Design a protein around this ligand. Structure first.
Ligand SMILES: Nc1nc2ccccc2s1
Ligand SMILES: Nc1nc2ccccc2s1
Lengths: 202, 215
């Protein structure tokens, strides 16, 4: 798998040089494709309003150079479809991901619209909160996808040694050698924790 | 000023918190971010932080002893202890607003298959503890989730619904694609109307749950 990340903060994605030569991850400074001596990457939004919108001419040139017809173009955005584990599984078999990191106010919509006439494009949000930029979302997506590269209910509490620590004992069932019972106990712990923390999953 | 301590076995990995939005916040002195190697609180020469789970199962569990010593040194009773975990309560924008008012956040990053539950149980007897998930996907470790949390929170610190619709900037025509004319009209009310519509039409397609619909 090849992953190209485009960002105005290239140093952000250097740590995730975490291996083993199975994937290739390359980070590109978006300013490579700017046109002016000021290296401008955004401009005031049409229709008014706060913040800036990233320039289509800059992104268009960047994607033109980096993408191919086989590319899956990932665009993290707070207005995106949800990125889920199912999404990660799907993307883990792709030959080429390109992740376009932009500010939360967005990239000119015509960039994605144009790219979508030539390649597959996925606009996705990693959660119901707002980040200033796509870089952290890129990190999350890269981690979730790459750990799947062949290279329900919540999980309940986990325990390890020692059997007693600061007045708290490991649940005796876990030491019982009754593995059918252990499974049933873990199932109940999962049900209770899911009810408490994520009733939506039920 | 806010203080954020992060505890991890991959301290170098938390470097992306520099020269960025959190980088700007640090440089402006609105937050102090400190990263600590969990292995600093081990005492064996192989610096073991994990062990096989009681009761069986895949992978390893982080030992409570090392974590307990680390949190003893770093936390006070006023600390908000944040533990990223896929089994956590949802971390949302409301959570971010809430934590943006905290004096002291400590983020415990776990790896392998989780941290011995007694760490959070013990901590809860002394301080407030929040186990949270940033989304329904699996990471290898809590570090990337810590970066997400730090960014979502810090942008809300003083001094630093529905989906946003599409945005456009110059030029008005590009590759034969035109900016929606209403945005070039100067009519604030028509623009407001068009955007509200776009925002609701994008919401119903990508996130019907926000509007109280299935899927
Ligand atoms: N929840 C998310 N917020 C942002 C902000 C900017 C870019 C991407 C994303 S995903
Ligand atoms: N979605 C999340 N996955 C993980 C994995 C390990 C530690 C923390 C978290 S949060």
């Amino acid at each position: 798998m090849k992953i190209d990340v485009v960002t105005i903060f290239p140093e952000y994605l250097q740590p995730v040089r975490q291996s083993a030569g199975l994937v290739d991850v390359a980070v590109h400074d978006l300013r490579r494709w700017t046109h002016d001596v000021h290296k401008s990457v955004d401009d005031s939004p049409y229709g008014g309003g706060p913040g800036m919108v990233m320039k289509p001419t800059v992104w268009g040139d960047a994607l033109d150079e980096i993408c191919t017809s086989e590319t899956l173009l990932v665009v993290p955005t707070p207005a995106g479809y949800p990125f889920t584990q199912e999404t990660a599984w799907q993307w883990s078999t792709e030959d080429h991901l390109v992740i376009a990191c932009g500010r939360y106010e967005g990239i000119d919509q015509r960039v994605a619209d144009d790219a979508a006439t030539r390649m597959r494009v996925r606009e996705v949000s990693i959660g119901d909160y707002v980040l200033n930029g796509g870089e952290a979302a890129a990190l999350v997506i890269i981690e979730a996808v790459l750990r799947l590269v062949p290279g329900s209910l919540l999980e309940g509490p986990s325990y390890t040694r020692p059997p007693s620590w600061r007045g708290m004992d490991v649940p005796p069932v876990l030491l019982s050698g009754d593995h059918a019972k252990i499974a049933a106990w873990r199932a109940e712990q999962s049900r209770q924790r899911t009810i408490e923390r994520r009733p939506d999953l039920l």
